Write a protein that binds this DNA or RNA. Structure first.
Lengths: 200, 200, 200, 200
DNA sequence: GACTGACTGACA
DNA sequence: TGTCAGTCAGTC
DNA sequence: GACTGACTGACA
DNA sequence: TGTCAGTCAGTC
């Protein structure tokens, strides 16, 4: 059994997941969590904060998972790295599709809340972000390919693929599990393509 | 002067642009178009249809512009093509930022309307989409790089760059016009990178 | 029959009158005015504005009445003036006890709204206010009695008596009508007392 | 250190002081007193009783202070008396502005509680009240100035000045301390004015 | 037709 | 205490 | 007793 | 989508 608070957060994820911020009611969350609607504003003051706390909760978890990954893989080659990492992200998207579907909702929410969160992210991001800067020094670039330019490309790809598939396979984890294996290939090739394009 | 109907559509774009579907009221559109709120449901029956009509209007325009581009360039090499196209798209995004900002709202709207529109798109898309399929037969691929795989990559890139910058430079057209010229280079490199990666 | 809008304002006066700002519900106003609750926020955006509009409405009226009084009495001696004016104010308080009871509510409402209104008043007040400054030049003061000092005294008395009685005889117009006559005397004496105290 | 109970009462004063009855939450009082919200209804059963207990506490204090003043001054002439008293009251209002600001909230509260308290007051008041009745037999009145009439005037003035300034210099103790000395003169004049007006 | 905007009801 | 898409009665 | 604070329900 | 006075189960 989860503490009422924890069960709110969780229902909030399911609910925001299925409808996104605006379309999602607080009372559905209260029904789904089996709690008094008021309790929600006990813990979270208002809906905006609630979404926020929910999103932090979830990212807390991934960050944890990522940080552990990184250690166990600091040593890998960069692409080899991304290759493997992307794998795990899909494995998560399939083992926790509600969380996945919920993180995607971030764009639906007002300038204010959104920018707030994004900033809280750049912090967490800067780790991985900076690590990549280093593992590129390790590569023999073409004489027209900035490390700056390279980073943008990879960081776009990396997180862009995330949103690219993730809306396409939204509410269809079944269909993802099916297709996972191909995707992983397509990726491996895509990265392989970039490596060949950036190196001498 | 625009017909009252045409001025609704237009205000609807500005409005949906700045708030996205749900947060955007019909009565703001009626204030901003200077019309009776009832008029809106004269012309468009309901808000969903309204967003829809607005989105079609706008895409009618781009498709027209694109189709003309394609003729004047059907002959070019594929990357050379995208290179130059991306250029025009930014030029438009800067000359018509409201339209830009509105097209991006598509993700905020319910399964129903969204899917509808996306389908109406694949239609429009299929032209360019299919043209690319052809200009790739013209290329000497690596022995592990399906035409299928290639197309995904490019089509992702192509429209993914759109969303990548467009949120980053949202409400900052000044800052875009400044940076436009770099971007175009960054792109040319990126495409160059891909060409080198896919070919023998 | 009153326009729905006008009937809201009116019920709002009754209601605020009986409970004051905070304790008073909007839906009671809607019941009492026989209207959709939403219509209220059609016309007045929110409750604060509503109270405000109600208070302006009412003061509009008194100001009108006062301005007419003043003309018909510019010529009187100052006390003779206040004497008579006070009479009329009670005559109003008795002929329109709801309005009376409502104006008193002003103190119950948050710093914001309150200060706003009070300022809108000093404007209207400054007329009477300034007129009094003049009708004192007409008086032979004691050699220790500033016109400044005198004004404060009278302006305090004048409006202070208002609140002094008005809360005491709140919701008791019956009891006021009874007592009106004495009060008018007590006043006449009180003013008479001040005149004797300020003059040589 | 104050007993948790005593610290509730005190925070209740600050809180009711700044927002008045209805706008003031019990949980703010609990935050500001650093206590469990339930504790409040341990000690005071409900919010109405709480305000009440708070108000009595405070008036216990003033009455005590006043009763001591009266002894040390029972002998003085009546105006001389009020003159000097008013002085002390300001001194208190400046040394304890929260208490001041809280006593003024009395009008914001429902018929019931209010009337209750007011009655408990007439009791406390009757002392000073009755003393004044006596010190007026000592005065040679005008042949149209009832002792009754006189008392009203003075009792109004006396406590009316309190409310007159106190709202004007609300949340501005700095500005009061500045002006204190003038006020005291303005008063002395005012009283002087009344003495001259009531006597032969 | 186009056009209005006061008005509602069910919902946060 | 707000919030909004949609309707409705009716003018032009 | 004192003390807590998560929790509710009816209400804006 | 908030708002709040009051309760309730239970520790110390």
């Amino acid at each position: 059994m989860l503490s009422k608070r924890d069960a709110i957060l969780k229902a909030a994820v399911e609910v925001f997941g299925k409808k996104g911020y605006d379309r999602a009611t607080t009372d559905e969350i209260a029904e789904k969590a089996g709690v008094a609607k008021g309790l929600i504003f006990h813990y979270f003051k208002n809906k905006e904060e609630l979404y926020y706390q929910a999103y932090m909760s979830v990212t807390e978890k991934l960050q944890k998972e990522f940080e552990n990954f990184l250690m166990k893989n600091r040593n890998r080659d960069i692409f080899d790295f991304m290759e493997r990492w992307i794998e795990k992200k899909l494995e998560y998207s399939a083992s926790h599709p509600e969380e996945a579907d919920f993180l995607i909702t971030l764009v639906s929410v007002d300038e204010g809340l959104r920018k707030r969160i994004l900033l809280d992210l750049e912090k967490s991001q800067r780790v991985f972000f900076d690590f990549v800067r280093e593992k590129l020094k390790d590569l023999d670039l073409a004489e027209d390919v900035t490390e700056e330019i390279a980073l943008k490309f990879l960081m776009w790809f990396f997180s862009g693929f995330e949103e690219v598939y993730l809306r396409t396979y939204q509410g269809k984890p079944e269909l993802l599990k099916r297709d996972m294996n191909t995707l992983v290939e397509e990726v491996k090739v895509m990265l392989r393509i970039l490596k060949k394009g950036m190196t001498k």
